[PDB]
Design a protein around this ligand. Structure first.
Ligand SMILES: OC[C@H]1CNC[C@@H](O)[C@@H]1O[C@@H]1O[C@H](CO)[C@@H](O)[C@H](O)[C@@H]1O
Ligand code: NA
Ligand code: NA
Length: 367
């Protein structure tokens, strides 16, 4: 019953959205960022994942990241080669997995990265001096997407559906498109242009658009108002997402574990209520406990609070962030386990739950 904002979406893209809308009541898809690219202790293998090394299964949802594509780089900001990324997207999709993409766009004004707060949104939007730059940046995604296509025996082109999740965590102040660096109206203009350009001008038909504020900057006494800061309108969003690392044990959060569990459930309950009111689908688009320091994290801090409330449980998927490779990145950072990591057995339990689906037990999402 939810309908995509692209009324002409490909059959496979329509099917994915419809099937997520059906599956969400009884199930939760598990996702991992950069899951096939590397893990904490390995890089180079062309078909491997830390998640699979622990559980025997790939994640159901594969997250990927485009930052640097817009500058013509051959690899993204975490050194993931774009040609390999296209291969991995196609491989995951061929197995029935779901694809989602974020984009830590570099700062066009300074040439710095997404964390360089030099103002740029006002320049990029329609009427802005750098509007040609926004078009050029988006054109690089159009080209990347073409490298995901196949053409069948009848001459018809097919693509993997993509849950495209741009301009994320915009209620935070850490990215240049965030609060304090861009006005609310200019952010909305940026989002609306992104959709008009990709869906209407460029006629991409394989996208599902996900909106994803950060929970850590939402007042829980006024959740809906905070969630809807910068919301561009129902004609511009398909997935009512949320990045919530706060209620799952973030080091800076002084709330007790019991308060945090309750807040996780409440955040997802309200997310789902917003999605229901709008005819959309909700998802926990980013979460996790960096370095997996919390005993029984998966069952006690993630699955338990989601399953505690029937509204909260109607999220369609949950994705955790990447497993950075220690040999080349000096800051230890990971959100899924690897063999021998302390939470590995609890992650097996999470996988084993009847609620949680990894790639190996997905129904056919694309018909
Ligand atoms: O803390 C984990 C996430 C939370 N969401 C914002 C994101 O920037 C952050 O992780 C960083 O992600 C970038 C892009 O992949 C990466 O370069 C950094 O090293 C962090 O993983
Ligand atoms: Na669900
Ligand atoms: Na399961």
């Amino acid at each position: 019953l939810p309908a995509l904002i692209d009324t002409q979406a490909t059959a496979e893209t329509r099917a994915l959205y419809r099937n997520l809308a059906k599956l969400r009541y009884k199930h939760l898809l598990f996702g991992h960022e950069d899951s096939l690219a590397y893990g904490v202790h390995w890089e180079g293998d062309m078909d491997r994942s830390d998640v699979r090394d622990v559980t025997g299964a790939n994640p159901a949802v594969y997250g990927w990241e485009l930052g640097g594509l817009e500058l013509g780089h051959t690899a993204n900001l975490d050194a993931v080669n774009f040609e390999k990324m296209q291969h991995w997207i196609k491989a995951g999709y061929s197995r029935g997995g779901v694809i989602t993409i974020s984009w830590h766009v570099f700062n066009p004004v300074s040439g710095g990265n997404s964390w360089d707060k030099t103002p740029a949104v006002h320049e990029l939007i329609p009427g802005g001096a750098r509007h040609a730059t926004l078009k050029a940046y988006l054109d690089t995604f159009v080209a990347f997407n073409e490298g995901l296509a196949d053409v069948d025996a009848q001459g018809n082109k097919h693509y993997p559906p993509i849950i495209f999740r741009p301009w994320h965590e915009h209620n935070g102040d850490w990215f240049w498109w965030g609060k304090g660096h861009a006005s609310e109206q200019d952010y909305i203009a940026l989002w609306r242009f992104t959709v008009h350009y990709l869906r209407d001008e460029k006629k991409l038909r394989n996208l599902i658009y996900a909106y994803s504020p950060d929970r850590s900057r939402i007042d829980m006494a006024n959740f809906e108002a905070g969630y809807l800061y910068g919301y561009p309108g129902d004609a511009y969003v398909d997935i009512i997402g949320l990045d919530n690392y706060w209620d799952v044990g973030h080091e800076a959060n002084t709330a007790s574990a019991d308060e945090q569990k309750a807040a996780l459930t409440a955040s997802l309950k309200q997310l789902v209520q917003i999605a229901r009111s709008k005819g959309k689908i909700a998802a926990l688009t980013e979460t996790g406990n960096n370095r997996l320091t919390i005993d029984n994290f998966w069952t006690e801090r993630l699955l338990g609070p989601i399953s505690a409330d029937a509204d909260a449980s109607e999220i369609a998927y949950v994705m955790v962030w990447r497993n950075a490779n220690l040999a080349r990145e000096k800051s230890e950072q990971f959100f899924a386990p690897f063999p021998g990591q302390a939470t590995a057995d609890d992650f097996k339990r999470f996988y084993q739950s009847e609620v949680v689906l990894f790639e190996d037990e997905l129904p056919p999402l694309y018909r």
